[PDB]
Homo-oligomer: A and B are copies of this chain.
């Protein structure tokens, strides 16, 4: 659904068509003007950062594994005559429709008997999904993956690509897959009895030399070398695929460009009348196009074990019954062609729709992981109460759409209760300790991180014990639309730390809430604060991120009693464009204000600019008003004359309109 994913984008964000991606890492964000203030009994110290960049790093790598599951049939496409008043295939009108058609008379009785089983095999989501992946593999084919590269680095702990993804050879995305071609046979119209467990599709005119090569590779096993997101492992959809094309199927060309895959999709959707099938495939790919680079070192627990992708079995019986598909189809919603029409016009817009969906999910799974099991709406039972339909199993797209509904605070409506795609809530529901590997840089690591060893020499491979999952992404596109006090993503905020002159700089935060806001605002001001817990004896640093520049309470890496000693004569100025706290006395009052917002994207430590035309909000009415218009100007070549007009020179001629 293009419509619901479009509304997630911010108001200030004005996207263009083309986006020239030339790397496997993008820092999307915005530039804002922060007017910071520090008030005290001595006086006020004002600062101003005119261009403050708040970013979330997003990569094109992520371990996924496809499995073939059984899903509901999508009945949108078949002629409206055979359907009854309630909206199910009234068998008896099917036998009537087949009888009054251009079918062979000896096949009518035997084909009608099979109809009861074969007409309820309508799900082309798996085919469209694979064909969409082939489009983006050939478009962004020049992106590279190095084996000994930095997945994450925060100064203390480092995590390499070798650690998370073993059995991984370095190669380009184009050179990753070597897809073998499945057989594309021609359906004989005079076949005695239809062959079930072999799908048959429709086609307009002649199957081109390149269309054979695309359909051949789409219905085949994906066995990748490099762990890419749009080239993950998928099982063999089918062995053989029939195509009811009276004009013969040309043999396989071997080569094809990304423009030829768009040609193949547009013919397949139009012939089969499968637009709702495409809408399902569009939302599936939106989840599993890009995966987020973790915000903290201990936020890598989400991507340790491979999340399963639920691909519904390829099943289509249109080739055997050409009569039942015509120009008057049955559809539930009137805006059922909107998702395809959006993709054909603006293919590269999927990148923005993808980051919008994963940012919405991973933000909400952040503040869902911090609720006790003894509650009404908890970790296990947040999907059941929200869903008001009848899906087969609460997995895939249902779990991701219900998290988006919680974030935006609106009602998401789909025409069919389809349960296909990636399932994210895997590591959460387990409710056990996860052992993430790490290579150390400094020697004073295991004070900060909950490490397995207490003394570790530099360059050693250690393990961190993560119990509660910290947030993987900070809200950026969904900044101050549905604000919570955990993230504290306000435009205006203030904190009041109360100290007396008798205290020699040392302040104890009994409250946990205002400790989080103090440590966060001090980092905007470019000050390196290092607090020490009095009960346990561990240490926390506000500088625990190089992207967002905020301090969340989950950076403590421990749930206990709150007694944080902060010594305010060991505060060090780290960044540029900073206010100085030289020597405070009395009550401190910190405050900031974010005024304006400008969309910015970075890649390879350089600005990535959006190019091409101005993207519009395509509606169903905007095309069918031109159908209402029809260009009703009678196609008659009316040539109008020009009267020559003489003036002073007479050498040169001058023509007038009348």
Give A contacts to B, CB under 8 Å. 14, 16-18, 20, 50, 70-73, 75, 81, 84-86, 88-93, 106, 109-110, 112-114, 116-117, 120-121, 193, 196, 204-206, 208, 257, 259-260, 262-263, 266-267, 341, 344-345, 372-374, 380-381, 390, 392-393, 468, 500-504, 506-508, 510-511, 534-535, 559-563, 565, 609-614, 616, 622-626, 631, 635, 649, 651-652, 657
Contact = CB atoms under 8 A, between A and B. Distances in A.
27 contacts: A18-B70, A20-B70, A71-B611, A72-B611, A72-B613, A73-B612, A90-B345, A90-B622, A90-B623, A92-B341, A106-B205, A106-B206, A112-B266, A113-B263, A114-B259, A116-B262, A116-B345, A372-B502, A373-B501, A392-B611, A503-B559, A503-B560, A508-B563, A510-B510, A534-B562, A624-B657, A625-B657
Contact of A511 (B20, B106, B510): B510
B534 A92 contact: no
Given A14-B390, A112-B266, A373-B501, 20 more contacts: A16-B392, A72-B612, A84-B622, A85-B622, A85-B625, A88-B622, A91-B341, A93-B623, A93-B626, A109-B204, A113-B266, A116-B345, A117-B262, A120-B613, A392-B610, A500-B651, A502-B559, A503-B561, A534-B534, A624-B657
Contacts of A121: 18, 611-612
A351 to B, nearest CB: 16
Q: Chain B CB within 10 Å — which of A344, A374, A510, A562 has the most?
A: A510
Nearest to A328: B633
A117 B259 contact: yes
A91 B344 contact: yes
A534 B561 contact: no
A613 B89 contact: yes
Number of copies: 3
Contacts of A392: 16, 609-611
B372 A565 contact: no
Contacts of A503: 559-561
Contacts of A257: 193, 196
Given A113-B262, A508-B535, A502 B93 contact: no
Q: Please list the 3 inter-chain residue pairs (A to B) with the smallest Cβ-Cβ separation, ordered nearest first.
A: A534-B534, A508-B561, A113-B263
Contacts of A266: 109, 112-113
Nearest to A70: B611
Contacts of A90: 345, 622-623, 626
A6 to B, nearest CB: 16
Contacts of A208: 110
Nearest to A611: B70
Q: Chain B CB within 10 Å — which of A50, A109, A372 has the most?
A: A109
Contacts of A262: 113, 116-117
Q: Chain B CB within 10 Å — which of A468, A561, A649, A657 has the most?
A: A561
B635 A614 contact: yes
A267 B109 contact: yes
Contacts of A631: 81
